[PDB]
Design a protein around this ligand. Structure first.
Ligand SMILES: CN(C)c1cc[n+](Cc2ccc(-c3ccc(Cn4cnc(N)c5ncnc4-5)cc3)cc2)cc1
Ligand SMILES: CN(C)c1cc[n+](Cc2ccc(-c3ccc(Cn4cnc(N)c5ncnc4-5)cc3)cc2)cc1
Ligand SMILES: Nc1nc[n+](Cc2ccccc2)c2[nH]cnc12
Ligand SMILES: Nc1nc[n+](Cc2ccccc2)c2[nH]cnc12
Lengths: 354, 349
């Protein structure tokens, strides 16, 4: 129930008063209710609401989420959020302004990492993912995001110099793998791994999945995927592979390095099959009406596909994490997260026999 | 034809943003011609190229040229999603790809046809009712008039005849006049609504093959100046456009005709169509109550029309300095002010 600093309170009041219709337009500053949802140095969240004793005038919301950035991609993220809201595939957009936005408040909690493996959950994550992999979005259709971003991080990574000895020591270990050659070896493997270019979330982890309040007894319609800011047209294998990788990481751990990694929490073949059996009919529409041997061939190939791209999830977020150790001031063990992603990378390679 | 650099940029945008036969277009294959310009262009496959299906054969490319883009972009995307504007096919830093709508623009003379007018009023009402994630304080109208007035007072032209016209315009005492206008409009109730702000014939498409529809043959396009504004401004502004023909083939490249302003009857025809499309419980009011609403509405829009003359008059002065396009802006500015003083005389205000 934490209060923002009184200058933020005033700015939030004005945005709510001017952007929101109905009882909000005539609210005084002293009637305004706000509490921090999440702090941090950027992308801060607040809940704003009317007094309980204030009646609504029409269909205006009683309660909204304020998102403050704390600063091209700005236009792309804004248009995407607007489109998704229009398609009921995300929170409504109530206000956009240079410092942030006002969004629909969705009563909910995020999933915990252990919940990702629950069959009803997985099935539904697979369906939602298939669904927006299917949609049209006014963005560049060339799949350059994946390797373009890896190349960009690699370049930054090679330029990095740390001063603190345990960071320099850890950086020496990661560099000793020859990351540029590893990149090329990975590129070449993925060039021979067919994967359809689709519109990808790119960050489908539990923290970005909402368990809808009141819908816990719905078997197949209780979730919403959020936080599409890293979306792009990309290889389907990445979006799915990346999601499977996230089974292994728990970001709620309270001691340094502030995550737990468990190589044994990666989904089993049966768990993967259950995920892709739910994905496939939702994305192909009459997939169930194929011969069993053809369904099977598609499924076995898609498993190879997402498991090879899972390797790009490790390599890419490994590199990202090294970069974060340099530029971020967040309390998170970035170097240790990097080493965990590379460990998983080579363990995955050995498993696949590549 | 366009600049060979613009041709190249445009070719890559179509190739990378659009599905099907666009994805493997070779380069010598790209058809593109200029259509306006904030430049517009038509991009197409050659006739020879068959579609892989579902992808447009023709598209419009828009370049912004000389944050506003964020708002305009979100806005266009919303209208496309709602089926109110052209579809959005690509969005990028310098501009966008849009659906090409087989259509032509209306001519000035067509604004006054009863069916056209009735439908313009209905589309406007519908545009007005919609919710948009933008600032709802109606600060647009006078904020923009202030900003242009300030620039106009600093403006200096090099050429003598422009200096001479600016001097006549400045002698009306525009700062005092702005305050009289403000005070008149602060006492004229007008609901705040999502306004188009530029509802003229150049921005209204007559849809191809739909010419026989009495009530559904048009789309309002080009909403880049949109904002929450007083409803009276959009309407009065639209009325003032009955006076101006922008297809005049010689200098100053417009005809102004004060007698073409809608008559009371034509105004009533427009608002009788607007009201039931904006309120919807309006059709069920008593006859006398409708009559009261309409007569107040005539005063309302006619008074706001003064702000259309005043604002675009000032705007036109600034454009004279910066726009190298061919249009006599100083003469248009004078035409708007003549109209402003005539309308004040007509109103007793
Ligand atoms: C799409 N991108 C840029 C990705 C980057 C990294 N990954 C791997 C990954 C995922 C989550 C996390 C992570 C770390 C900490 C948290 C917890 N947390 C969440 N919010 C905050 N403000 C936090 N401040 C400190 N810790 C905060 C949540 C997620 C770290 C790395 C996936 C995608
Ligand atoms: C909402 N805003 C910014 C407005 C500004 C001015 N007005 C009044 C007005 C409207 C149209 C025009 C105008 C002028 C010329 C044209 C013709 N035209 C049309 N397209 C071009 N590329 C032209 N190049 C030269 N002339 C061109 C069309 C409309 C001038 C003033 C209304 C709204
Ligand atoms: N638009 C949103 N609505 C709800 N949540 C989740 C949320 C629930 C309870 C408390 C705090 C946050 C979001 N998390 C991110 N966006 C939203
Ligand atoms: N999206 C559009 N589709 C069609 N027109 C009108 C148009 C037709 C033929 C040639 C030139 C313009 C527009 N004018 C502005 N936008 C459009």
């Amino acid at each position: 129930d934490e209060q923002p600093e009184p200058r933020t309170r005033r700015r939030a009041y004005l945005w709510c008063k001017e952007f929101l219709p109905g009882a909000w337009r005539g609210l005084r500053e002293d009637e305004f209710h706000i509490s921090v949802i999440r702090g941090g140095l950027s992308n801060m969240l607040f809940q704003c609401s009317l007094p309980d004793t204030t009646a609504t005038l029409g269909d205006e919301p009683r309660k909204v989420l304020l998102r403050l950035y704390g600063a091209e991609a700005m236009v792309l993220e804004s248009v995407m959020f607007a489109i998704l809201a229009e398609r009921s595939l995300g929170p409504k957009l109530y206000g956009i302004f240079p410092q942030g936005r006002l969004e629909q408040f969705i009563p909910s909690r995020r999933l915990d990492t252990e919940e990702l493996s629950l069959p009803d959950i997985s099935a539904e994550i697979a369906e939602k993912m298939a669904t927006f992999h299917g949609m049209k979005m006014p963005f560049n259709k060339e799949p350059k995001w994946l390797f373009g971003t890896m190349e960009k991080y690699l370049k930054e990574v090679l330029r990095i110099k740390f001063t603190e000895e345990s960071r320099i020591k850890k950086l020496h270990k990661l560099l000793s793998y020859n990351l540029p050659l590893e990149l090329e070896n990975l590129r070449s493997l993925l060039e021979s791994t067919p994967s359809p270019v689709v519109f990808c979330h790119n960050d489908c982890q539990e923290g970005n999945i909402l368990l809808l309040e009141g819908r816990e007894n719905s078997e197949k319609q209780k979730l919403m995927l959020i936080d599409f800011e890293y979306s792009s047209y990309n290889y389907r294998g990445f979006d799915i592979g990346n999601h499977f990788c996230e089974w292994m990481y728990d970001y709620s751990y309270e001691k340094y390095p502030f995550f737990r990694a468990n190589i044994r929490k990666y989904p089993t073949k049966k768990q993967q099959l259950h995920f892709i059996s739910s994905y496939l009919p939702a994305f192909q529409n009459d997939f169930e009406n194929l011969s069993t041997e053809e369904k099977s061939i598609i499924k076995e190939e898609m498993l190879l596909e997402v498991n090879r791209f899972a390797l790009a999830s490790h390599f890419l977020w490994g590199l990202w994490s090294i970069v974060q150790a340099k530029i971020s001031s967040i309390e998170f063990g970035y170097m240790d997260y990097a080493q965990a992603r590379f460990d998983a990378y080579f363990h995955q390679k050995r498993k696949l026999g590549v």
